[PDB]
Write an enzyme that holds these catalytic residues in place. Sequence first.
Site, PDB file in Angstrom:
ATOM      1  N   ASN A 180       0.803  -1.184  -0.001  1.00 15.33           N
ATOM      2  CA  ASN A 180       0.217  -0.041  -0.054  1.00 15.33           C
ATOM      3  C   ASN A 180       0.853   1.433   0.036  1.00 15.33           C
ATOM      4  OD1 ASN A 180      -3.114  -0.776   1.623  1.00 15.33           O
ATOM      5  ND2 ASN A 180      -2.002  -1.898   0.349  1.00 15.33           N
ATOM      6  N   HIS A 230      -1.891  -6.830   6.290  1.00 21.87           N
ATOM      7  CA  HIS A 230      -3.113  -6.581   7.038  1.00 21.87           C
ATOM      8  C   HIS A 230      -3.064  -7.177   8.786  1.00 21.87           C
ATOM      9  CE1 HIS A 230      -5.840  -7.269   3.326  1.00 21.87           C
ATOM     10  NE2 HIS A 230      -5.155  -5.999   3.146  1.00 21.87           N
ATOM     11  N   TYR A 239       0.751  -9.571  -1.206  1.00 15.80           N
ATOM     12  CA  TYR A 239       1.301  -8.195  -0.773  1.00 15.80           C
ATOM     13  C   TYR A 239       2.558  -7.720  -0.907  1.00 15.80           C
ATOM     14  CZ  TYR A 239      -3.825  -7.176   0.317  1.00 15.80           C
ATOM     15  OH  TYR A 239      -5.232  -7.204   0.192  1.00 15.80           O
ATOM     16  N   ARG A 293      -5.238 -14.975   0.682  1.00 13.70           N
ATOM     17  CA  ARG A 293      -6.356 -15.526   0.323  1.00 13.70           C
ATOM     18  C   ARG A 293      -6.747 -15.493  -1.486  1.00 13.70           C
ATOM     19  NH1 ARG A 293      -7.105  -9.541   0.614  1.00 13.70           N
ATOM     20  NH2 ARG A 293      -8.146  -8.724  -1.011  1.00 13.70           N
TER      21      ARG A 293
HETATM   22  C1  LIG Z   1     -13.022  -5.313   4.542  1.00 14.31           C
HETATM   23  C2  LIG Z   1     -11.943  -4.101   5.110  1.00 14.31           C
HETATM   24  O1  LIG Z   1     -12.655  -3.080   5.550  1.00 14.31           O
HETATM   25  N1  LIG Z   1     -10.725  -4.380   5.153  1.00 14.31           N
HETATM   26  C3  LIG Z   1      -9.808  -3.492   5.577  1.00 14.31           C
HETATM   27  C4  LIG Z   1      -8.536  -3.379   4.832  1.00 14.31           C
HETATM   28  O2  LIG Z   1      -8.837  -3.152   3.334  1.00 14.31           O
HETATM   29  C5  LIG Z   1      -8.527  -4.046   2.524  1.00 14.31           C
HETATM   30  O3  LIG Z   1      -7.202  -3.840   2.175  1.00 14.31           O
HETATM   31  C6  LIG Z   1      -6.720  -4.793   0.835  1.00 14.31           C
HETATM   32  C7  LIG Z   1      -5.384  -4.300   0.640  1.00 14.31           C
HETATM   33  O4  LIG Z   1      -5.214  -4.001  -0.771  1.00 14.31           O
HETATM   34  O5  LIG Z   1      -4.437  -4.329   1.327  1.00 14.31           O
HETATM   35  C8  LIG Z   1      -7.771  -4.773  -0.148  1.00 14.31           C
HETATM   36  O6  LIG Z   1      -7.236  -5.661  -1.374  1.00 14.31           O
HETATM   37  C9  LIG Z   1      -7.687  -5.915  -2.768  1.00 14.31           C
HETATM   38  O7  LIG Z   1      -9.128  -6.170  -2.903  1.00 14.31           O
HETATM   39  C10 LIG Z   1      -9.392  -6.445  -4.333  1.00 14.31           C
HETATM   40  C11 LIG Z   1     -10.814  -6.907  -4.264  1.00 14.31           C
HETATM   41  O8  LIG Z   1     -11.023  -8.055  -3.713  1.00 14.31           O
HETATM   42  C12 LIG Z   1      -8.555  -7.792  -5.123  1.00 14.31           C
HETATM   43  O9  LIG Z   1      -9.088  -7.616  -6.313  1.00 14.31           O
HETATM   44  C13 LIG Z   1      -7.052  -7.220  -4.766  1.00 14.31           C
HETATM   45  O10 LIG Z   1      -6.134  -7.966  -5.699  1.00 14.31           O
HETATM   46  C14 LIG Z   1      -5.228  -7.081  -6.601  1.00 14.31           C
HETATM   47  O11 LIG Z   1      -6.403  -6.669  -7.213  1.00 14.31           O
HETATM   48  C15 LIG Z   1      -5.792  -5.956  -8.617  1.00 14.31           C
HETATM   49  C16 LIG Z   1      -6.677  -5.295  -9.252  1.00 14.31           C
HETATM   50  O12 LIG Z   1      -7.203  -6.244 -10.420  1.00 14.31           O
HETATM   51  O13 LIG Z   1      -7.178  -4.037  -9.025  1.00 14.31           O
HETATM   52  C17 LIG Z   1      -4.664  -6.578  -9.106  1.00 14.31           C
HETATM   53  O14 LIG Z   1      -4.157  -5.795 -10.281  1.00 14.31           O
HETATM   54  C18 LIG Z   1      -3.204  -5.948 -11.230  1.00 14.31           C
HETATM   55  O15 LIG Z   1      -1.713  -6.026 -10.298  1.00 14.31           O
HETATM   56  C19 LIG Z   1      -0.463  -6.033 -11.528  1.00 14.31           C
HETATM   57  C20 LIG Z   1       0.618  -6.055 -10.555  1.00 14.31           C
HETATM   58  O16 LIG Z   1       1.649  -4.968 -10.462  1.00 14.31           O
HETATM   59  C21 LIG Z   1      -0.630  -4.872 -12.371  1.00 14.31           C
HETATM   60  O17 LIG Z   1       0.502  -5.074 -13.324  1.00 14.31           O
HETATM   61  C22 LIG Z   1      -1.808  -4.629 -13.135  1.00 14.31           C
HETATM   62  O18 LIG Z   1      -2.003  -3.666 -14.147  1.00 14.31           O
HETATM   63  C23 LIG Z   1      -1.821  -3.686 -15.172  1.00 14.31           C
HETATM   64  O19 LIG Z   1      -0.123  -3.878 -15.479  1.00 14.31           O
HETATM   65  C24 LIG Z   1       0.321  -3.933 -16.849  1.00 14.31           C
HETATM   66  C25 LIG Z   1       1.877  -3.943 -16.584  1.00 14.31           C
HETATM   67  O20 LIG Z   1       2.328  -5.488 -16.587  1.00 14.31           O
HETATM   68  O21 LIG Z   1       2.573  -3.050 -16.402  1.00 14.31           O
HETATM   69  C26 LIG Z   1       0.004  -3.436 -17.938  1.00 14.31           C
HETATM   70  O22 LIG Z   1       0.549  -2.883 -18.652  1.00 14.31           O
HETATM   71  C27 LIG Z   1      -1.409  -2.497 -17.485  1.00 14.31           C
HETATM   72  O23 LIG Z   1      -1.242  -1.319 -18.060  1.00 14.31           O
HETATM   73  C28 LIG Z   1      -1.728  -2.296 -16.164  1.00 14.31           C
HETATM   74  O24 LIG Z   1      -3.088  -2.202 -15.886  1.00 14.31           O
HETATM   75  C29 LIG Z   1      -3.068  -4.719 -12.148  1.00 14.31           C
HETATM   76  N2  LIG Z   1      -4.363  -4.593 -12.747  1.00 14.31           N
HETATM   77  C30 LIG Z   1      -4.855  -5.532 -13.762  1.00 14.31           C
HETATM   78  C31 LIG Z   1      -6.377  -5.382 -14.517  1.00 14.31           C
HETATM   79  O25 LIG Z   1      -4.161  -6.577 -14.165  1.00 14.31           O
HETATM   80  C32 LIG Z   1      -3.532  -7.129  -8.245  1.00 14.31           C
HETATM   81  O26 LIG Z   1      -2.583  -7.951  -9.039  1.00 14.31           O
HETATM   82  C33 LIG Z   1      -4.085  -8.370  -7.191  1.00 14.31           C
HETATM   83  O27 LIG Z   1      -3.185  -9.039  -6.233  1.00 14.31           O
HETATM   84  C34 LIG Z   1      -6.700  -7.034  -3.313  1.00 14.31           C
HETATM   85  N3  LIG Z   1      -5.159  -6.640  -3.096  1.00 14.31           N
HETATM   86  C35 LIG Z   1      -4.375  -7.567  -2.864  1.00 14.31           C
HETATM   87  C36 LIG Z   1      -2.947  -7.037  -2.642  1.00 14.31           C
HETATM   88  O28 LIG Z   1      -4.663  -8.832  -2.613  1.00 14.31           O
HETATM   89  C37 LIG Z   1      -9.186  -5.218   0.138  1.00 14.31           C
HETATM   90  O29 LIG Z   1     -10.140  -5.244  -0.556  1.00 14.31           O
HETATM   91  C38 LIG Z   1      -9.650  -4.427   1.254  1.00 14.31           C
HETATM   92  O30 LIG Z   1     -10.926  -4.434   1.821  1.00 14.31           O
HETATM   93  C39 LIG Z   1      -7.440  -2.638   5.317  1.00 14.31           C
HETATM   94  O31 LIG Z   1      -6.170  -2.681   4.321  1.00 14.31           O
HETATM   95  C40 LIG Z   1      -7.076  -3.076   6.772  1.00 14.31           C
HETATM   96  C41 LIG Z   1      -6.101  -2.030   7.380  1.00 14.31           C
HETATM   97  O32 LIG Z   1      -4.704  -2.181   7.006  1.00 14.31           O
HETATM   98  O33 LIG Z   1      -8.240  -2.962   7.771  1.00 14.31           O
HETATM   99  C42 LIG Z   1      -9.333  -3.800   7.087  1.00 14.31           C
HETATM  100  O34 LIG Z   1     -10.611  -3.742   8.020  1.00 14.31           O
END
Ligand SMILES: CC(=O)N[C@@H]1[C@@H](O[C@@H]2O[C@H](C(=O)O)[C@@H](O[C@@H]3O[C@H](CO)[C@@H](O)[C@H](O[C@@H]4O[C@H](C(=O)O)[C@@H](O[C@@H]5O[C@H](CO)[C@@H](O)[C@H](O[C@@H]6O[C@H](C(=O)O)[C@H](O)[C@H](O)[C@H]6O)[C@H]5NC(C)=O)[C@H](O)[C@H]4O)[C@H]3NC(C)=O)[C@H](O)[C@H]2O)[C@H](O)[C@@H](CO)O[C@H]1O
Length: 721
Positions: A180, A230, A239, A293
């Site tokens: 993040n 987390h 992450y 997850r």
């Molecule tokens: C419930 C609540 O209140 N919870 C809080 C808690 O909040 C939570 O935080 C986390 C978190 O991020 O820490 C959240 O996590 C995310 O949730 C979503 C929804 O389920 C998941 O989908 C997500 O997993 C990630 O999703 C991305 C996405 O599709 O948006 C993935 O994206 C891709 O990643 C690639 C890696 O670099 C990237 O390259 C790619 O883009 C493309 O890249 C190209 C390239 O190669 O360069 C290219 O050219 C392109 O142009 C470019 O678009 C990118 N997108 C695509 C379409 O491929 C990602 O890989 C995947 O992992 C999930 N995140 C993780 C890390 O797992 C959660 O939803 C929140 O609720 C708080 O954090 C906490 C306190 O700390 O308290 C809690 O109570």
Amino acid sequence: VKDTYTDRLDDWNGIIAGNQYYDSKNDQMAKLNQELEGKVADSLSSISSQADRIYLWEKFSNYKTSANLTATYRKLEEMAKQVTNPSSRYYQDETVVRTVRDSMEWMHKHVYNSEKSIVGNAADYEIGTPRAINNTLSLMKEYFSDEEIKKYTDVIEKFVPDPEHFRKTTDNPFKALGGNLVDMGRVKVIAGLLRKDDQEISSTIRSIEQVFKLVDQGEGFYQDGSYIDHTNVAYTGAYGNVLIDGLSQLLPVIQKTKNPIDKDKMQTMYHWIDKSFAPLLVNGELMDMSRGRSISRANSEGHVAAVEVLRGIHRIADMSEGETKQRLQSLVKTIVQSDSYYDVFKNLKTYKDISLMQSLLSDAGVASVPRTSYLSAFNKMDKTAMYNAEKGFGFGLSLFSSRTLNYEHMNKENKRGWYTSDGMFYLYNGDLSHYSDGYWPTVNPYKMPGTTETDAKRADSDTGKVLPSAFVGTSKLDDANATATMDFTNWNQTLTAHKSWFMLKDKIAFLGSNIQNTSTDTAATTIDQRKLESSNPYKVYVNDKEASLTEQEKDYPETQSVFLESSDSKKNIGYFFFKKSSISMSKALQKGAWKDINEGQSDKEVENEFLTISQAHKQNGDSYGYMLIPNVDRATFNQMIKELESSLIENNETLQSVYDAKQGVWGIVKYDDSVSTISNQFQVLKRGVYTIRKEGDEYKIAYYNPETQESAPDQEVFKKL
Ligand SMILES: CC(=O)N[C@@H]1[C@@H](O[C@@H]2O[C@H](C(=O)O)[C@@H](O[C@@H]3O[C@H](CO)[C@@H](O)[C@H](O[C@@H]4O[C@H](C(=O)O)[C@@H](O[C@@H]5O[C@H](CO)[C@@H](O)[C@H](O[C@@H]6O[C@H](C(=O)O)[C@H](O)[C@H](O)[C@H]6O)[C@H]5NC(C)=O)[C@H](O)[C@H]4O)[C@H]3NC(C)=O)[C@H](O)[C@H]2O)[C@H](O)[C@@H](CO)O[C@H]1O
């Protein structure tokens, strides 16, 4: 308007798309280009046209689910990639340019602006969506004015204003650490270049730099290679992956800004690669115990996930020089070449990533040598990873403690992770596909291999828990030998066990003592639940005579050994019982759907055959006791169980021990401060975990106290007898 900000953005475009590198004669580039062509065709033939509308795309229409914002803007980014590619059929296409513009405007006016509040999950309003807007804008910045670019990013500023804090507009905000913080980076540096804002870029870089700090608690990297996210979850392999993936894209850009990042604060990145990520990579597969997850996603199985890390490393390598560049090039090349199961290129999504991998694989100057044996005791996240180069297998041990969460079920993902850290083990063998091809939706989540459990039914609405006890940890002696234990209590305080594991170079011993159950539910330990290949049947032996397994469970009382014999030695699995033990086994088709375990996934039926070995525990005070011996032919297994006839020193409520006579090594776990004499050679004195080697007339000692998370002076824990 064209200056150094847009020079920086030219460089970013080269990284996130890499149109400049596209070569239509390149088979692997041409294939990805084809995949973007078809994706842009589908968006273009699908999109809502005529008189003003309630959504852009119907599959992504409910603007209350926030994953629909990011998914919508990611469709526009894909258009911006094809529209700035000379070889796309959409190259400078008038419909495509107009469509991107009107769509940005429509989104701005109706769905995602500064008057909006976060509805649904914040990652989308603060990270996913802002990255897709910024990338869209950057690719296509010669088709927008400076005023339009400011207008379309004002929203990004409202949602992510501070360099330091990630959630600030809500009724509930937190601190940016970990991926993040690097995600904050990518959002704000690029929004900073797009909006010609020096304070935004500099303070954003000053802020990213804290990610280079090893931590003592909370999120980030620890000195033993653990990575936490987390709050309390083991998370290197999702992450962690973001962290390295994101930073490694941003660095070429950062390094040419007026605020470059010091080449000494860098050296921490290589320690991440060698200490944290590399141990987790076996034959091209990133171990599931570290992916939280993300195990529950059909499109990110272990070999696909691994590539996120690998392309991260290869970018780091490219920005290094001399010796460190060659070594990291070689690490990536050897991992990739060991992988006969997965084509790396299938997760390489930009032309420069393709290009970098291609040159790396065909450069004869870059060595591809088999990785050497290792063993990483990630105590700060209660995981242990082991790898034997001689014989060709890895081992993962998934635990939790009072300091860590057992499994993460969040955003409706990983509904049945319940027992994934209950002393679950992993075996990595000549079957690269084992934990893939729908392992996760098909494995029986009640019988996770290694775990001792009751058969109570579990509810999908359940969330993770910490363990009551702190007495959970690994004592590592060397690259081949360690010992682990886990002071086990189940999720509803009906069952316990003293579970311990003895890592001894080419085998692991599993001991459980003090097995107790206060429920009416039956208790059992799953010895194994191995996913099978139709193409490689096991011949199964009990006490060295062929058995034939059925869907129906069959009892094998008085069992000293079970042996699973493939035509390939590197898929063989032996289980040696120190004392004759009462076991049962079956082989059965198991069905389910990815949707069963991640709500956002496909409901299509998947199936696989599994072979299950269990041991019932009907009495309080019960015990188990066996040696896992992978990657040896039957005759070799038969000899080893003779060498090991007397290897079990003790397996009771206060003391567990195994002895490898061939190595001269003891593993020992003590639950109390009594004097334990061992093999008539030495005594051990304190509660904790021990790995000991006799070299002639001295002892090397690895003592670890898991509760205090400290070793100790030799004289407080060990005495020659
Ligand atoms: C419930 C609540 O209140 N919870 C809080 C808690 O909040 C939570 O935080 C986390 C978190 O991020 O820490 C959240 O996590 C995310 O949730 C979503 C929804 O389920 C998941 O989908 C997500 O997993 C990630 O999703 C991305 C996405 O599709 O948006 C993935 O994206 C891709 O990643 C690639 C890696 O670099 C990237 O390259 C790619 O883009 C493309 O890249 C190209 C390239 O190669 O360069 C290219 O050219 C392109 O142009 C470019 O678009 C990118 N997108 C695509 C379409 O491929 C990602 O890989 C995947 O992992 C999930 N995140 C993780 C890390 O797992 C959660 O939803 C929140 O609720 C708080 O954090 C906490 C306190 O700390 O308290 C809690 O109570």
